[PDB]
Structures are given as structure tokens and as C-alpha cells.
Amino acid sequence: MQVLHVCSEMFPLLKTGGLADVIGALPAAQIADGVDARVLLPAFPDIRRGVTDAQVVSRRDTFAGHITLLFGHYNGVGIYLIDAPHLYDRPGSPYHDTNLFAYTDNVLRFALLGWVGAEMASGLDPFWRPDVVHAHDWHAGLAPAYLAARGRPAKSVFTVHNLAYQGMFYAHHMNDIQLPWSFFNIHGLEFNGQISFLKAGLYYADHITAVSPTYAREITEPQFAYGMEGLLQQRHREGRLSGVLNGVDEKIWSPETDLLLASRYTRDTLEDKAENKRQLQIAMGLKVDDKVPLFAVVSRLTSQKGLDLVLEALPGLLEQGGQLALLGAGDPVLQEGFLAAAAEYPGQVGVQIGYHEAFSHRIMGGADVILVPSRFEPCGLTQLYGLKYGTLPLVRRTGGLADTVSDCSLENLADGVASGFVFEDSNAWSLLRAIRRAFVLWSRPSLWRFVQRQAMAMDFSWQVAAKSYRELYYRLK
Ligand SMILES: Nc1ncnc2c1ncn2[C@@H]1O[C@H](COP(=O)(O)OP(=O)(O)O)[C@@H](O)[C@H]1O
Ligand SMILES: O=S(=O)(O)C[C@H](O)CN1CCN(CCO)CC1
Ligand SMILES: OC[C@H]1O[C@H](O)[C@H](O)[C@@H](O)[C@@H]1O
Numbered sequence: 001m002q003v004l005h006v007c008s009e010m011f012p013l014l015k016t017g018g019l020a021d022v023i024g025a026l027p028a029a030q031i032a033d034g035v036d037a038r039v040l041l042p043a044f045p046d047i048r049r050g051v052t053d054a055q056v057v058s059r060r061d062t063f064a065g066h067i068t069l070l071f072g073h074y075n076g077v078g079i080y081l082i083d084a085p086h087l088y089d090r091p092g093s094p095y096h097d098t099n100l101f102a103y104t105d106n107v108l109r110f111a112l113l114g115w116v117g118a119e120m121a122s123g124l125d126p127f128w129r130p131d132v133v134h135a136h137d138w139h140a141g142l143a144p145a146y147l148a149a150r151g152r153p154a155k156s157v158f159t160v161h162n163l164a165y166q167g168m169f170y171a172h173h174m175n176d177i178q179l180p181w182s183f184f185n186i187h188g189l190e191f192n193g194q195i196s197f198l199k200a201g202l203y204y205a206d207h208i209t210a211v212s213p214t215y216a217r218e219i220t221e222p223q224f225a226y227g228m229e230g231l232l233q234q235r236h237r238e239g240r241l242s243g244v245l246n247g248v249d250e251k252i253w254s255p256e257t258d259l260l261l262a263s264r265y266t267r268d269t270l271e272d273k274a275e276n277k278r279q280l281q282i283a284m285g286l287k288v289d290d291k292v293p294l295f296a297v298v299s300r301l302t303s304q305k306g307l308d309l310v311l312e313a314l315p316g317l318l319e320q321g322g323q324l325a326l327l328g329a330g331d332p333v334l335q336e337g338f339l340a341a342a343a344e345y346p347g348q349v350g351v352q353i354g355y356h357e358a359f360s361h362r363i364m365g366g367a368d369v370i371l372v373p374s375r376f377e378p379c380g381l382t383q384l385y386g387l388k389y390g391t392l393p394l395v396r397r398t399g400g401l402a403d404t405v406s407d408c409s410l411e412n413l414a415d416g417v418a419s420g421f422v423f424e425d426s427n428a429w430s431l432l433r434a435i436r437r438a439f440v441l442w443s444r445p446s447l448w449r450f451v452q453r454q455a456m457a458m459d460f461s462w463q464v465a466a467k468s469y470r471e472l473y474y475r476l477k
Pocket of ligand 1: 017
């Protein structure tokens, strides 16, 4: 069984969110579970420089211009790179220019990603051809459409990591992407009078997967599907929609082995976590104090994540005696609101605006609680990292957060299953009840520790996820 993943990012070479983490760990896990998994990425500069043994496989002309298909290895996995300097050799984000504007040739940049995933099924590589083409998110959304246009020489799965990003392009671009004009239909890739790369992946894929069991159900609702629900409801009924939870990459996210930490520690030696906390307090400019709970955020700053609610609730949090440490970048309203909060409460609120990979480990390894108050959350990896690091997650019951965190209620405590704090509604009062829950658990240090050790007993394994993907791939054949 040979599978090609088609995607736009991969940790540690290029990452803007959780997707990169998945693509960096899932394939190696699949190989260990008996599937021959390879990855296809655009040759963005950080990607191209990371794959140092890449060799030429072929050259082709394309509706988007010429490509050199390269193949090398990263961390023992086979990586194909689409080297097309005129599309992909640009600094910064893979998705937008330095002024945060989507590149105007994005339609071609990402149509080509999908076209190459499909062509791989037709022998683009003389020495290897996938049985299944596994496309991830809108960027890779056209891979199943090109496959359909060609008579489906391989099967396809489409995984939605996030249904809010739809890859909308004007309809006239049907002229530019070499697909049958007849694909521009409601039963096809048309969505609200435009081309949608997400609609295309959802429509043409043999099977659709979401990145948690509950998100898979949620996207059959208008509230989470934003117009795709009728399509997703139909695929559910046909048995062509399922949820497979993400794992965590233990080589990177384990406090037991984490070289990025002041002090490593385990489920049975959590006293060794305290130094991380002390150093994090110093680093953020917070008061150095082990008697006080340290709440943290590590997160993209968009409305998805419900962080305006954190701002609203912050005075309540401070009033009860907690600190906040935030790392994140995105919406300038959020950036400026949190900077202002940091300026307003020196020693209580510490804030760093930007993307900082190493610093996120130091937060995760030093904080007491991780706040993930999402409006929607396909999976959420930060809360999985908190569990593993014994930093109790405080989450809204939605998406993968609903699948992974167990509230500190009476039954869950008694059953020894409690691992974090959960609130229901997207408003600051509801968030604030869970925060108070946290302060109450905090005043009972031996209950807090009991909850920490259960959080750290939870396991989210990529080789277990791969078993599920593998069953799917074989069912498809
Ligand atoms: N500002 C940041 N600095 C460093 N890492 C970040 C930052 N923001 C998000 N991350 C990381 O990006 C990944 C986010 O994954 P996830 O929780 O699934 O949410 P999303 O994919 O929606 O961003 C995690 O590894 C998280 O630690
Ligand atoms: O905004 S764009 O649609 O132009 C580009 C991406 O959709 C932005 N992303 C990166 C991939 N994502 C999933 C990463 O976990 C979040 C949305
Ligand atoms: O699948 C990895 C990540 O993808 C998406 O970007 C989601 O926003 C996030 O919840 C998920 O964990």
C-alpha cells in the first residue's frame, strides 16, 4: 500500500499551524504500521533547503509553467518537492506577501500542487506511483478533481484540517487550471458562484476525513460548515465521511526529553517542572511566585480561537490571583489588546507577539494551565501538548477539544478520568466559571496533582491513528 500526502507544509521545515505538525509525524508512523507513505510539497525555500539529498525525478510543462519534480528524504521519509521557482521561490509565508495579501497567482500556485499529486498517480515518477492520493485542506483540494478528470487512476482521501478556509477564486480561472469546464457546477467545484478548492476536495474525493471524531459530526451542521453542510450531510449518509484524531509527535513534544526546557520532568517527578515556571516568570517579566497559578496561551490570533473572551475575562482572572503568559500573532486588534493588557498589568500579564517555536515549549513546560477557548477547533494540538506536559487545558467543549479533555467534575474526579477544565458557551462568563473551577482545584494541591498525572497518562499516538487511516486506504483498495 503506497500513499502520497499532498499538502503545503511540514514541520520542522515549514509551519504556520497544526497541519505542519501532522505532516511531519504521520507518514513515519504509517511506515511503521506498514503503509509506504511519501509526501509532496511545493518547493518553498525553507522546504527546499531542508531536503539536502533531493534529486531530479522529472521535468514537465504544466498550465502553470514548468516544474522540476525533485525527490529526497527528510527524517527517513520520502519527500517530493515541486520546484517551480516562478511560483514558489518567494520569501516569507507560503500563502501571502509581506503585507499579508494573498499572492495574486495563488490559484495557479495551489492548482499546481493538486495537479502534481494527481499526475503522480499516472507515472510522473517512473519508479513509484501511489495507490491512494491523500490531500490535506484547500491547498491540495484540486488533487481529487484532477484524479476524477483522468478516470481515477488512484483512490483519494481528502482531509479537512479546517473548514473555515475555503480557497475561493473567481470563476474565470476555470480557463487557467486545465479542468473540464463541466466541473464548474454545484455538483462539482462551484460554491457561491466561485471556484472553491475546498468544495473540490470535498466533492471529488473518494472519502473525506476530518481531524477529530466530533469535528466530523460538527461539519454536517451549518454552524461549522458555512454552506458546505448539505454536501457533507450527503457524504455522511453514503458512508464517505469519518473522523480520525491527530496524534502528538513524542520526539518533539515530551517534557521527559524536551531539550528546549530549563528542566526536563516526568509524570512521577513533577517537582522538576517548577524551575521551568520560575524561568518563564522571569522571562515574561511576571512576579516570581510558585503560590500563584500561571495561565498561558500559545496560539494564532484569529476569531476561531475565542481569545477576545480571554481579554474580557482577564480582570476576573487577575482578581483571583492568577498570571497570564501569551504568545501569538495574527489580528492586530487582538495583538494590540493583549499588548495593552501587558502594559496595564506589569508583573501579572506578560505578552510576546510573534511566532516563536522554542519559546512555545518553554511556556508549555512552565505554565499551570493552557487556555484554548476556541469557537471551533477541528482538533487542537496545543491542548494535547498541555495534557502531555501536565499543564491542564481549559477548553470550550467543541471539536477535538470535546474529544480529548475531561472536565474536573465530581464523576470524572471519582472515576480518575478528569484531566482539565471545560466550559460550554462562547462568552466570557462561561469562560470565567471554568477559570474559577481552576482556582478552586488550585487551592487543593493534591487534587491538582491527581489531575496532572491523569492529563499526563492520556496518549495520542500517530501509529494508532495510522491504523485507522490504513483500514480506510484498504477499504478504498
Ligand atoms: N505564536 C506561536 N509561536 C509558536 N508556535 C505557535 C504559535 N501559534 C501557534 N503555534 C503552534 O502551532 C500549532 C497550532 O496547532 P493547533 O493547536 O492544531 O491549532 P491551529 O492549527 O488552528 O493553529 C501548535 O504546535 C502551536 O504550538
Ligand atoms: O488563508 S489562506 O486560505 O490563504 C491560507 C491558509 O488557508 C491559511 N491556513 C494555513 C493552514 N491552516 C491549517 C494549519 O493547521 C490554517 C489556515
Ligand atoms: O490538524 C491540525 C490542525 O489543523 C487545523 O488548522 C485546526 O485549526 C487545528 O485544530 C488542527 O489541530
